[PDB]
Design a protein around this ligand. Sequence first.
Ligand SMILES: CC(=O)N[C@H]1[C@@H](O[C@@H]2[C@@H](O)[C@@H](CO)O[C@@H](O)[C@@H]2O[C@@H]2O[C@@H](C)[C@@H](O)[C@@H](O)[C@@H]2O)O[C@H](CO)[C@H](O)[C@@H]1O
Ligand SMILES: CC(=O)N[C@H]1[C@@H](O[C@H]2[C@@H](O)[C@@H](CO)O[C@@H](O)[C@@H]2O[C@@H]2O[C@@H](C)[C@@H](O)[C@@H](O)[C@@H]2O)O[C@H](CO)[C@H](O)[C@@H]1O
Lengths: 284, 284
Amino acid sequence: PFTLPNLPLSSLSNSRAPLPISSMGISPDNVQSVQFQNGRCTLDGRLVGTTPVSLSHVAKIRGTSNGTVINLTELDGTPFHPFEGPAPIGFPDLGGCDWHINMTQFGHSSQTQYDVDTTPDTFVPHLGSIQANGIGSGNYVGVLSWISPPSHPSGSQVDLWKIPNYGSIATHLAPSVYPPGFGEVLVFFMSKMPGPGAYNLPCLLPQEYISHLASEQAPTVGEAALLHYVDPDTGRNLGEFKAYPDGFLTCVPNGASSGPQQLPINGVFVFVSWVSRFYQLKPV
Amino acid sequence: PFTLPNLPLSSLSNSRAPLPISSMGISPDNVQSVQFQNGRCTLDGRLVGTTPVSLSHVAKIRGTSNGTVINLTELDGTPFHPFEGPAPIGFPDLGGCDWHINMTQFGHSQTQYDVDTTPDTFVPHLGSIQANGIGSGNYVGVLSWISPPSHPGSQVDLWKIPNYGSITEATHLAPSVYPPGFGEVLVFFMSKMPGPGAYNLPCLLPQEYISHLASEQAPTVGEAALLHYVDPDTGRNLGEFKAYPDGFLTCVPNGASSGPQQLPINGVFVFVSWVSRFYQLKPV
Ligand SMILES: CC(=O)N[C@H]1[C@@H](O[C@@H]2[C@@H](O)[C@@H](CO)O[C@@H](O)[C@@H]2O[C@@H]2O[C@@H](C)[C@@H](O)[C@@H](O)[C@@H]2O)O[C@H](CO)[C@H](O)[C@@H]1O
Ligand SMILES: CC(=O)N[C@H]1[C@@H](O[C@H]2[C@@H](O)[C@@H](CO)O[C@@H](O)[C@@H]2O[C@@H]2O[C@@H](C)[C@@H](O)[C@@H](O)[C@@H]2O)O[C@H](CO)[C@H](O)[C@@H]1O
């Protein structure tokens, strides 16, 4: 029926950058809902936001610099239009930080580091343009390399739970994700992101979970999916979790000892059955 | 019951580099066999060579440099040992060319690592490669672009693999893949690779196929699976293919100028049924 990848978490990838998943976590005290644009897929198999099927499209950009601006296109080279979304499919969605994209060219040698500040009004990927920060004329394909603290919210710290400013504060943003409540906490898959700090990138689903869900457009019954996080070596059930139709998991923490982050990351999520949205999970 | 990802080839990735698939093709006449180390998975879900589950490990290296050599570890940081294989999981497998990997660090603010896979200092199988000017420190690197081999006006031949050991030496490489004959030919998924030329990187299975077969762990009945490359738009069968146990596809080209090379990239492969190894395919 409905299925999730029968693969160990630590072997999967983040969905907002091509990084391996290192642990599971929760949002900080000051984050209730999130609105990531990448790593968004319904249990139905419907890609949301700028989420691509393949990790080979994640946190990447493509376009032509005329010396002052870079006109964006799909990674494909086919045109991008505002009505389609906040930015081209795959566009980085890491807010609260400056980006450093590695730029390459088909037909040309070498690479160039592209420093991106997502706060000026020259940064408008929704309208198909972003400031060329010294990147000279030519066609480029870039991938997020490493990040750093924001240049203009002067002195501010890296905050990856945020999303960048796509439009020039209606960019057709994917709806934001809200915790169901009543004891249930949203689970995030974390990864370490290169840069001058101990940066941790969260995402709602592992990228392979997305390609798998988009592949298995399973007629998802039930308002919520009861899953077991199991150790593939012992078959031991390490705790119950829930998967909602919008494409996110939750669980119930155990007060102090905590929950998700305590669990080892070599486990596998297994679909046990369709339950009601109001089903109660045993702690973890 | 065995399956293949119900996703368009054009939205999937190459398995030897994190690059989108741009087309399908055949090996040049001067290539009778292939021995790629990444992108190897049996229909059984058995990963071979240095093949990883996630694209987040593809064509990446990890190790500590002392300015002279780089002692490699798994992307993980966990140690590597000769007995484990030709190189750590995910180590770039592109022979016939020089590499240019983008090096980054956790905790520091990228460096281009120019790699000649030809010298004596290049022994990733012994977990050690020359630091071509790369300063001391720990780094995570990913292949960015390629260029002609430093040794011997040699051409860029992406159908070869690098010399992992110090030519002939048991580096525990994955076995070779041979065209079963019978008019059948090996099918490759190609991706355009950055560099000073029109480079096309071939692989035996998109990366999305690997994570899927490894997840399915489906018992390989029959000697080969009969496949139909279907157009999702019109639902029409665009040609018959066969998938074999070791993890490769084949087809009978209906002439030199006719083959998978001329089919549209947005089709989906669909398992129709298990047939005899000898089953003759209709030309494509
Ligand atoms: C390349 C880089 O690491 N940029 C970061 C860096 O800020 C840069 C950097 O060169 C540091 C080195 O000491 O000096 C800063 O002044 C510089 O700021 C950046 O460039 C200057 C000329 C102005 O354009 C600034 O607005 C811009 O941020 O660290 C920054 C935060 O301190 C930020 O992460 C940059 O991306
Ligand atoms: C950075 C780069 O583009 N490297 C490729 C390039 O290397 C050669 C050129 O950069 C050339 C430009 O005038 O300068 C040469 O010094 C350089 O040669 C490289 O280093 C020397 C010492 C030898 O070891 C060469 O084998 C080596 O390539 O072009 C070569 C091919 O000619 C390679 O693709 C380099 O990766």
